[PDB]
Amino acid sequence: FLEGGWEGMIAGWHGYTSHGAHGVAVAADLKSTQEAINKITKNLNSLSELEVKNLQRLSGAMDELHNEILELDEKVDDLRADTISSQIELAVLLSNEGIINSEDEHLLALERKLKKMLGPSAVEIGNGCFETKHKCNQTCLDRIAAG
Amino acid sequence: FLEGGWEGMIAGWHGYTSHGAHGVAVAADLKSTQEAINKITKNLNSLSELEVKNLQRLSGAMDELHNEILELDEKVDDLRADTISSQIELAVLLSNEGIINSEDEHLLALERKLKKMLGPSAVEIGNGCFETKHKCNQTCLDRIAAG
Amino acid sequence: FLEGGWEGMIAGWHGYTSHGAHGVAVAADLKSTQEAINKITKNLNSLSELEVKNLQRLSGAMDELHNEILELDEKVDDLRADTISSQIELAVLLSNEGIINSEDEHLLALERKLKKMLGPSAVEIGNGCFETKHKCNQTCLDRIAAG
Amino acid sequence: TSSNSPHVVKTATQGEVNVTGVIPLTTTPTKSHFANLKGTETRGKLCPKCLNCTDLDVALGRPKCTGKIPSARVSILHEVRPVTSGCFPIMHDRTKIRQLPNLLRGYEHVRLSTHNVINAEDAPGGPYKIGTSGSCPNITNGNGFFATMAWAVPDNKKTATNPLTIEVPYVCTEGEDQITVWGFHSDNETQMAKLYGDSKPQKFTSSANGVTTHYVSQIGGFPNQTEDGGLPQSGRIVVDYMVQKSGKTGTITYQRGILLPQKVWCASGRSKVIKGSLPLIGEADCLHEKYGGLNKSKPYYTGEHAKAIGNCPIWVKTPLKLANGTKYRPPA
Amino acid sequence: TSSNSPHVVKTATQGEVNVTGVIPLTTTPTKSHFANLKGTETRGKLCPKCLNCTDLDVALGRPKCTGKIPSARVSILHEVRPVTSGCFPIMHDRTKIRQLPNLLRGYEHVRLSTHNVINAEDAPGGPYKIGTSGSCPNITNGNGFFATMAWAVPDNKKTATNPLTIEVPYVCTEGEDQITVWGFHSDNETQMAKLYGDSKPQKFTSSANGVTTHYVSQIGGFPNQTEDGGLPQSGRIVVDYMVQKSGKTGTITYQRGILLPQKVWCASGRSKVIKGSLPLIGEADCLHEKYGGLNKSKPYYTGEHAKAIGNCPIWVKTPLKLANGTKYRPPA
Amino acid sequence: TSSNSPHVVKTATQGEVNVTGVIPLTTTPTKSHFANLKGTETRGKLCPKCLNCTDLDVALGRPKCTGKIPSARVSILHEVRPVTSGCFPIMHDRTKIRQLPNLLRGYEHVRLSTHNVINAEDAPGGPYKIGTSGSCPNITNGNGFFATMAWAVPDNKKTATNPLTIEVPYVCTEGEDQITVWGFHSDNETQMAKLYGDSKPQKFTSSANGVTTHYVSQIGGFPNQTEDGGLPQSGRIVVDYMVQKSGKTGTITYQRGILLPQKVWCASGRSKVIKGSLPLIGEADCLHEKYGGLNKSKPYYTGEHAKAIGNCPIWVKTPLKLANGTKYRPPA
Numbered sequence A, B, C: 001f002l003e004g005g006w007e008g009m010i011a012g013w014h015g016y017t018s019h020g021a022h023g024v025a026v027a028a029d030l031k032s033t034q035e036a037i038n039k040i041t042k043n044l045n046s047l048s049e050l051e052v053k054n055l056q057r058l059s060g061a062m063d064e065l066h067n068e069i070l071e072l073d074e075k076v077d078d079l080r081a082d083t084i085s086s087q088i089e090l091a092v093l094l095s096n097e098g099i100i101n102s103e104d105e106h107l108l109a110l111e112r113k114l115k116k117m118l119g120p121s122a123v124e125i126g127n128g129c130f131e132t133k134h135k136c137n138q139t140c141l142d143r144i145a146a147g
Numbered sequence D, E, F: 001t002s003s004n005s006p007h008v009v010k011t012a013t014q015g016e017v018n019v020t021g022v023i024p025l026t027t028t029p030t031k032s033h034f035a036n037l038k039g040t041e042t043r044g045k046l047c048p049k050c051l052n053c054t055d056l057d058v059a060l061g062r063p064k065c066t067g068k069i070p071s072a073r074v075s076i077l078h079e080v081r082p083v084t085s086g087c088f089p090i091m092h093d094r095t096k097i098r099q100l101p102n103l104l105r106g107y108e109h110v111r112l113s114t115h116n117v118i119n120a121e122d123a124p125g126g127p128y129k130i131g132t133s134g135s136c137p138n139i140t141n142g143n144g145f146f147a148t149m150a151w152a153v154p155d156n157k158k159t160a161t162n163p164l165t166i167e168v169p170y171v172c173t174e175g176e177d178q179i180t181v182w183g184f185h186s187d188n189e190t191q192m193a194k195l196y197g198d199s200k201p202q203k204f205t206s207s208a209n210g211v212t213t214h215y216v217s218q219i220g221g222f223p224n225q226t227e228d229g230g231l232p233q234s235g236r237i238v239v240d241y242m243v244q245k246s247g248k249t250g251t252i253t254y255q256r257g258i259l260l261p262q263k264v265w266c267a268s269g270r271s272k273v274i275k276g277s278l279p280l281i282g283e284a285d286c287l288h289e290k291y292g293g294l295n296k297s298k299p300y301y302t303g304e305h306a307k308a309i310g311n312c313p314i315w316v317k318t319p320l321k322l323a324n325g326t327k328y329r330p331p332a
């Protein structure tokens, strides 16, 4: 239901699962949810903000009359196109490598703050969902999700 | 023998050392060993797959007759060569920075899965080799190395 | 005084705070302090060491007489300038992203070595300053800061 | 959280990976019409208000095609090989004159001069009368000729001459290039004898900024008339241009049949020029050579690379996607 | 695991670090022979089947050097300064003709035309007979001349003339450039008088696509014969070429001694051209200007940068290595 | 540790962040004087020891401006449009001669030849006497002329002639380009008749490496004298140059008034050339076109991009800063 995954609702795209004996209390951390959205927004903008100069024709190079110069001009435009495309691909690929490799830090950070809020009472393995030594109801879980 | 290092066999290039009172049981995680090989293979290929357009002569620029155009053409080829070399060096240097800085995560990840398999019985410092509160023989260690 | 921060002395730019019942013993890890300085120095140098070829005029292209070639030459110099600037900005931006994101590893690494030196006696949350189960005076703290 | 996550993104070192959501960064533009670039003045024809004129008639000063050329920062190269639509028959392919309008459009500011560069009547070769043609009607429908040239026909003493030299002064202001249009007339043997007095082929040269040329006229045997006023003519003209870089004078050498420079073009600055096709319809944020106007819906595009002007998407080799979500985590 | 680990790799921010294993990414090529590029047709000589001919004899249509030029996408510029090996003595360094073959090799498809562009016998200057030479033997060992030119010698009325003009038609199909070869003959005073009727220096011009030239013949006093059929001659020829961009005609102006265009070259597409040296031995994945054929054993190379064609390693400034292992961990 | 930390640095993916300390990587240079590049020999004037001479007087061999040109690897283009300061009046703007010195400065090694390329006295056109001028005083204050040209005036038989041809030999060593300076004289009708015997306009041509030109002299009606010895003259000269690429000869065609080549320039290698302004004051690590000498205090700079030579900072678009410290941590 909360761990592993199933074809449920992903509307709060929540980063951690609930725990406890009170049936299955569920609450979402919407501060975390907004952080993730704002973070991707900033990354998208640093890429969409890239500006390069555009290419145009040489104003003094007339067709036919200066065909040799123009052949070189085409070569320059074409080589430049590979260069800029490669810089963009690297910027995007590095952005994605960074995003992909931030997956574990985000999840580990969430478990660490649960320990801060819950205290030195427990450890967990595998998925690692922190589990308490006391019962916590929906009101309790909402307070935790909200800090 | 297992910690620090010596001029022994490195054939399984193993990421963790054994522990326990049963003499010195030794087993290798060959899943981990293959992951490391497959990971470097993928990185090598993303670099060897780089394709850039090659440079050639301007077809309409004749020697001597159009020497001035050709001087510029040489300038273009030469500047392009620095540009591509620099992009490659950065891609390689970033790949190496990423590889070098993945050393601790690989080792920490290995110790974390040993804790998953062994349970919340112990901690360790310095090299951090997890050590149990129970005896584990070679058959036991092989089961652990194999999951 | 040590946590959070105030308008005090930052001369040893120290990475961790002290703990203990002996008033407020304070000692700095100057090995850590030098590591941080040497690390930034190396990064600064890998950037200041970038070398690219410089641009000059075509030796055979005379003003007016070969104005069309020269217009293209200016285009080439200008496009090259964007290309090199972009490579530098990326190298610098990646260097800064790496520096900014190394903040937590540096602090976590410092707390881990305190645990190595102090033993498996305690945990802490929030700022995480390790706190002992025994009194440690200024001489004790100096030995810890010094290893 | 996890969902059905088959989206694929690439990383620099891990090759391809599966993720739970992506943000496409690229699009593929669809070819459309050229449009005015938004904000910046865009030049189509050299003189948008010179009706029943084309760029080469305007460039040559054809009667009734004169007028102001608007300044512009962006120009579209509508005609690769400009043509004429009137006045005297021109043997266009003998010179480089068809590209004159494509030179003028490359300047930000283009104006025709206010005074004749050369006194055509009083010039080496003797007193001249200035010729007109029924093919080049003026604003009162009389017989005119190109504003940029004087057809200098000897008044008297219709004899053969030796090459004569005129230094063509620089009359534009500093910083402006001066483009001088000049040329020559030729006819069959009978008319050359009646009009100039010398039926043999005439020779002409020109020089500016170290660049020189040479022409020899053709006597009789002319090619069929195209791109002109429609009246039959026995003769033809050859028209060329000389470019005088700012501060320099040029030189013209001639015998009989010279069309002397009169008004000249003064021009400065630089327009951004791309190839394209008129009419310009509406406005666009970017003008692309292959795709016409674009509005940059995505920061990057895939497709055919070409020159462009404006707030353009950047061409890239492949589709690009950012990961938005985490790696695919199958429901296990 | 740790081993003796002195391998050094560089990182972007940590400078140099010691690792337990590396993967060299670069090599250093060793200069070898040029080879056919693997897969793609590679052009060496213009006509590989025209024996005892060089590229300039083929380009000029020397008798017995005619034939088909194979199309190719890759060409090697074997001769920087092409030479001839037969037919009439040519004062090669008076014009730009030595580079003609290097222009033809730059096209993907090159063919000589099937029909004469100009009727040489019936042309301005009066009826001509077409000259031949003992230096230019044909396939039946009679006296021929270059296929691309007609040596037009007046049949009668051997008098001096005024410059005459021929418009050279475009005969290639759309999209093909037309390269016209033309030239002139000159001799000493005695022979000019017997052959053409005018011993003074003759003048010639040409024009295409705005590009013009001018020549004046030399009478007598010719340079020593080289690169020709070996028979002594009192005269010499000057050969040039004109390039007519697709759709355009060109113009030739001449007096006596004109070698009129006959067959012309039609060409299209573009070959990839690098400098190199024949013979081509075997095949290679990449052809490099400094190193000859290469087979890309490593993705990058160090060494001297130069142009290349094919599945080439990418030049880099330094040796490059990936770390394969971890940082060096001394046995402590 | 934390401090007041408003410094802002940018990252590739997080946009802008606040840090506790930065290292500026960029500076903004201040325009200063040009200077000798440190270490490498820098060329200012072509002949620093030829006093009361400018680069065009040195290039033309003006009497008393001859001498050795130091080799240099770095050159500064002091005069965009070089001028003369003495000897015979030159109609500079008729040709491309003003740029001759800017061609010579582009070579690493430039020397004037030791022997005349052409025997001027014995040449086509008949025995010549070599002309001198009061405007061109030599080292003993007699009448000289440019070292690079012989003013060839017929000794006797002062008649009109037909164009004559001289092949100009290559006299430089292999690898050197040979730059030949030649020209022609012209005068009013009276003096042409007394000096050459032919008052009509004379024609000249030249050819090298496929590049050709043509000139027609002007008879009388000359422009006002500038940039010369100061004595009045009725005539004027036209001076041009021909560049013969290594191993090739060139050709000059002429009638009367020819200034024949004598000494020629031999040159090789390449200098690094930027635009600038003399005098050079002191030394600098980098010479920039807009900023003069720079000493690279920071690895990068912002400001106006331009060409440069030396150990230069690299131009970047924005100020750049490294983070030195951690992110800002407000005192909480």
Ligand SMILES: *[C@@H]1O[C@H](CO)[C@@H](O[C@@H]2O[C@H](CO)[C@@H](O[C@@H]3O[C@H](CO)[C@@H](O)[C@H](O)[C@@H]3O)[C@H](O)[C@H]2NC(C)=O)[C@H](O)[C@H]1NC(C)=O
Pocket (backbone or CB within 6 Å): D132, D138, D139, D140, D141, D142, D143, D144
């Ligand atoms: C359109 O073209 C016509 C001619 O094709 C121009 O008309 C001509 O204008 C000139 C200048 O005013 C007249 O010249 C003068 O003629 C008188 C005759 O007595 C003479 O005494 C003067 O010394 C001078 O030569 C010319 O005769 C007149 N021709 C005709 C047929 O009217 C007309 O001005 C042009 N229109 C425009 C707007 O340019």
Ligand SMILES: *[C@@H]1O[C@H](CO)[C@@H](O[C@@H]2O[C@H](CO)[C@@H](O[C@@H]3O[C@H](CO)[C@@H](O)[C@H](O)[C@@H]3O)[C@H](O)[C@H]2NC(C)=O)[C@H](O)[C@H]1NC(C)=O
Pocket (backbone or CB within 6 Å): D188, D189, D190, D191, D234
């Ligand atoms: C050279 O060009 C001129 C034109 O500038 C040609 O002259 C023209 O020749 C035609 C005949 O072929 C003449 O037409 C006739 O005119 C009379 C006039 O009374 C009329 O009665 C006839 O019914 C017919 O229309 C025309 O007038 C004449 N025009 C001029 C200005 O002379 C000349 O023939 C050409 N010569 C060569 C060798 O090509």
Ligand SMILES: *[C@@H]1O[C@H](CO)[C@@H](O[C@@H]2O[C@H](CO)[C@@H](O[C@@H]3O[C@H](CO)[C@@H](O)[C@H](O)[C@@H]3O)[C@H](O)[C@H]2NC(C)=O)[C@H](O)[C@H]1NC(C)=O
Pocket (backbone or CB within 6 Å): D032, D282, D283, D284, D285, D293, D294, D295
């Ligand atoms: C780029 O964006 C511009 C701005 O949205 C697009 O041009 C605009 O297109 C609309 C629809 O064709 C025009 O609306 C018209 O308004 C008049 C008002 O009287 C109305 O009568 C018409 O029926 C219609 O609704 C709008 O005026 C026009 N804007 C401008 C400045 O001309 C443009 O097409 C987009 N181009 C691309 C490549 O996406």
Ligand SMILES: *[C@@H]1O[C@H](CO)[C@@H](O[C@@H]2O[C@H](CO)[C@@H](O[C@@H]3O[C@H](CO)[C@@H](O)[C@H](O)[C@@H]3O)[C@H](O)[C@H]2NC(C)=O)[C@H](O)[C@H]1NC(C)=O
Pocket (backbone or CB within 6 Å): E132, E138, E139, E140, E141, E142, E143, E144
């Ligand atoms: C190789 O060159 C020789 C000449 O150097 C060519 O032979 C010549 O061919 C022409 C055309 O068939 C002959 O012209 C005709 O001569 C008869 C003579 O009665 C005349 O009645 C015709 O009106 C016409 O002028 C010419 O005489 C002949 N010359 C010789 C010496 O045989 C030969 O055809 C060329 N071979 C090839 C493959 O091109």
Ligand SMILES: *[C@@H]1O[C@H](CO)[C@@H](O[C@@H]2O[C@H](CO)[C@@H](O[C@@H]3O[C@H](CO)[C@@H](O)[C@H](O)[C@@H]3O)[C@H](O)[C@H]2NC(C)=O)[C@H](O)[C@H]1NC(C)=O
Pocket (backbone or CB within 6 Å): E188, E189, E190, E191, E234
């Ligand atoms: C201009 O060029 C022509 C060649 O096209 C030169 O004519 C040749 O002159 C030589 C003598 O120097 C003649 O050789 C002699 O021929 C007779 C024939 O009976 C023979 O008995 C002698 O033993 C000797 O071989 C040659 O035949 C003649 N050829 C032609 C076609 O005329 C001419 O001398 C040159 N003139 C100048 C001013 O350079």
Ligand SMILES: *[C@@H]1O[C@H](CO)[C@@H](O[C@@H]2O[C@H](CO)[C@@H](O[C@@H]3O[C@H](CO)[C@@H](O)[C@H](O)[C@@H]3O)[C@H](O)[C@H]2NC(C)=O)[C@H](O)[C@H]1NC(C)=O
Pocket (backbone or CB within 6 Å): E032, E282, E283, E284, E285, E293, E294, E295
């Ligand atoms: C790039 O790789 C190609 C392909 O391996 C290399 O060319 C090949 O070289 C071998 C050895 O020289 C040739 O083998 C010969 O086969 C004949 C078969 O009858 C045998 O009689 C000979 O004794 C010999 O064993 C092979 O044919 C040839 N392949 C081709 C397509 O020509 C090439 O040399 C490598 N180039 C570089 C730069 O490394």
Ligand SMILES: *[C@@H]1O[C@H](CO)[C@@H](O[C@@H]2O[C@H](CO)[C@@H](O[C@@H]3O[C@H](CO)[C@@H](O)[C@H](O)[C@@H]3O)[C@H](O)[C@H]2NC(C)=O)[C@H](O)[C@H]1NC(C)=O
Pocket (backbone or CB within 6 Å): F132, F138, F139, F140, F141, F142, F143, F144
């Ligand atoms: C500076 O220019 C003057 C002339 O403007 C040069 O003086 C001239 O030098 C030549 C060569 O030595 C003298 O020619 C000879 O004259 C004698 C007279 O009897 C004659 O027999 C010889 O056959 C030969 O023609 C010429 O007379 C002399 N002129 C004058 C006025 O002295 C002077 O040499 C030049 N200085 C330098 C350093 O180049």
Ligand SMILES: *[C@@H]1O[C@H](CO)[C@@H](O[C@@H]2O[C@H](CO)[C@@H](O[C@@H]3O[C@H](CO)[C@@H](O)[C@H](O)[C@@H]3O)[C@H](O)[C@H]2NC(C)=O)[C@H](O)[C@H]1NC(C)=O
Pocket (backbone or CB within 6 Å): F188, F189, F190, F191, F234
């Ligand atoms: C063509 O150029 C020549 C110069 O090379 C001009 O000749 C010069 O004409 C002036 C008069 O305008 C002469 O001045 C007079 O000389 C006599 C000598 O006895 C003196 O007594 C007078 O007081 C006065 O100074 C000058 O000598 C003469 N020089 C030469 C070398 O002939 C000629 O007039 C010009 N012709 C044309 C059509 O432009």
Ligand SMILES: *[C@@H]1O[C@H](CO)[C@@H](O[C@@H]2O[C@H](CO)[C@@H](O[C@@H]3O[C@H](CO)[C@@H](O)[C@H](O)[C@@H]3O)[C@H](O)[C@H]2NC(C)=O)[C@H](O)[C@H]1NC(C)=O
Pocket (backbone or CB within 6 Å): F032, F282, F283, F284, F285, F293, F294, F295
């Ligand atoms: C780049 O760095 C060089 C080297 O520091 C700067 O040139 C140097 O400037 C100093 C001060 O102007 C010169 O010192 C002088 O020494 C003489 C010794 O007799 C003394 O009499 C003077 O009063 C003065 O102290 C020094 O000689 C000079 N070095 C050289 C090689 O000329 C240069 O100005 C800096 N340029 C830039 C763009 O920053």
Ligand SMILES: *[C@@H]1O[C@H](CO)[C@@H](O[C@@H]2O[C@H](CO)[C@@H](O)[C@H](O)[C@H]2NC(C)=O)[C@H](O)[C@H]1NC(C)=O
Pocket (backbone or CB within 6 Å): A010, A011, A012, A013, A014, A033, A037, A044, D021, D022, D023, D324, D325
């Ligand atoms: C990145 O993915 C998230 C998750 O799907 C997108 O945010 C959702 O937007 C819809 C819009 O109707 C909302 O109903 C959902 O509640 C949002 N989900 C969450 C977890 O907040 C987001 O728009 C995507 N961003 C981009 C640039 O594509």
Ligand SMILES: *[C@@H]1O[C@H](CO)[C@@H](O[C@@H]2O[C@H](CO)[C@@H](O)[C@H](O)[C@H]2NC(C)=O)[C@H](O)[C@H]1NC(C)=O
Pocket (backbone or CB within 6 Å): B010, B011, B012, B013, B014, B033, B037, B044, E021, E022, E023, E324, E325
């Ligand atoms: C990266 O390093 C590993 C470790 O040396 C290489 O793998 C070894 O290959 C030999 C081949 O005979 C085997 O006998 C060893 O058992 C392998 N070791 C391990 C730990 O698997 C690997 O080939 C290197 N990769 C590259 C691209 O150089």
Ligand SMILES: *[C@@H]1O[C@H](CO)[C@@H](O[C@@H]2O[C@H](CO)[C@@H](O)[C@H](O)[C@H]2NC(C)=O)[C@H](O)[C@H]1NC(C)=O
Pocket (backbone or CB within 6 Å): C010, C011, C012, C013, C014, C033, C037, C044, F021, F022, F023, F324, F325
């Ligand atoms: C990076 O920041 C540190 C911290 O401010 C700088 O080091 C200080 O330098 C002053 C020099 O008088 C010393 O008094 C301080 O004690 C140093 N502080 C520490 C923590 O060592 C360092 O110079 C800066 N580096 C760069 C390149 O700007």
Ligand SMILES: *[C@@H]1O[C@H](CO)[C@@H](O[C@@H]2O[C@H](CO)[C@@H](O)[C@H](O)[C@H]2NC(C)=O)[C@H](O)[C@H]1NC(C)=O
Pocket (backbone or CB within 6 Å): D006, D008, D017, D018, D328, D330
């Ligand atoms: C990672 O991505 C690849 C490509 O998206 C997945 O491989 C393909 O998955 C589709 C699913 O419909 C199959 O039809 C194809 O046959 C698969 N390709 C191959 C070569 O087998 C891959 O499965 C994804 N990773 C995970 C964990 O599912």
Ligand SMILES: *[C@@H]1O[C@H](CO)[C@@H](O[C@@H]2O[C@H](CO)[C@@H](O)[C@H](O)[C@H]2NC(C)=O)[C@H](O)[C@H]1NC(C)=O
Pocket (backbone or CB within 6 Å): E006, E008, E017, E018, E328, E330
């Ligand atoms: C990191 O690499 C450097 C270079 O590989 C090592 O420094 C050199 O090591 C060799 C070993 O034979 C010595 O002979 C040289 O004298 C050393 N250079 C200098 C300047 O002292 C360095 O030792 C390596 N790091 C470690 C931990 O060993």
Ligand SMILES: *[C@@H]1O[C@H](CO)[C@@H](O[C@@H]2O[C@H](CO)[C@@H](O)[C@H](O)[C@H]2NC(C)=O)[C@H](O)[C@H]1NC(C)=O
Pocket (backbone or CB within 6 Å): F006, F008, F017, F018, F328, F330
């Ligand atoms: C991060 O940096 C930005 C820019 O340095 C800070 O925003 C500005 O801070 C100054 C401080 O004097 C205010 O006067 C401005 O009004 C602030 N800008 C805006 C748009 O409000 C920002 O505060 C910094 N982050 C933190 C935690 O302080």
Ligand SMILES: *[C@@H]1O[C@H](CO)[C@@H](O)[C@H](O)[C@H]1NC(C)=O
Pocket (backbone or CB within 6 Å): D051, D052
């Ligand atoms: C000339 O312009 C008018 C409009 O002013 C138009 O009706 C006419 O058709 C045009 N003539 C030609 C030949 O295009």
